[PDB]
């Protein structure tokens, strides 16, 4: 901030202030599990369950 | 000083005497102090107060 001062009046100081801010890190996973019979049924009957 | 002695009278000494004298060292200073306004007024209005 600026200050108004007279002829010989004593000046002040007013300085900027700073702060650091930090990221986190987040690992996300999705795992889906199915029987071999599902892969055989899907790919013979043309179901598209595995594609969905 | 000279001396008048005679036929076989005893001489006396009369010897010059000396002394030193020392100077002194004098540091002499002049300081004048003025507000930055006095400088701005002087150089704008051409007062000649700073040169004086």
Q: Is B41 exposed, middle or buried (0-12, 13-18, 19+ CB in 10 A)?
A: middle
Q: Which residue of A4, A5, A6, A8 to mutate against B (max B Cβ within 10 Å)? A: A8
For residue B38, the distance in angstroms to the closest alpha carbon of chain A comes to 9
**Structure-determination technique:** cryo-EM
Chain A residues in contact with B35 (beta carbon < 8 A): 7-8
DSSP codes joined into one string, chain A: ------SSPPP------------------------HHHHHHHHHHT--TTT-
Whether residue B33 lies within 8 A of chain A, CB to CB, comes out as no
Distance, CA of A38 to CA of A19 (rounded, Å): 55
């Amino acid at each position: 901030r600026g200050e108004v001062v007279g002829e010989s009046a004593e000046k002040s100081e007013s300085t900027a202030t700073f702060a650091p801010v930090t990221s986190l890190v987040r690992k996300v996973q999705v795992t889906q599990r199915f029987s071999q019979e599902v892969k055989w049924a899907d790919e013979s009957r043309q179901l598209g369950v595995l594609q969905t």
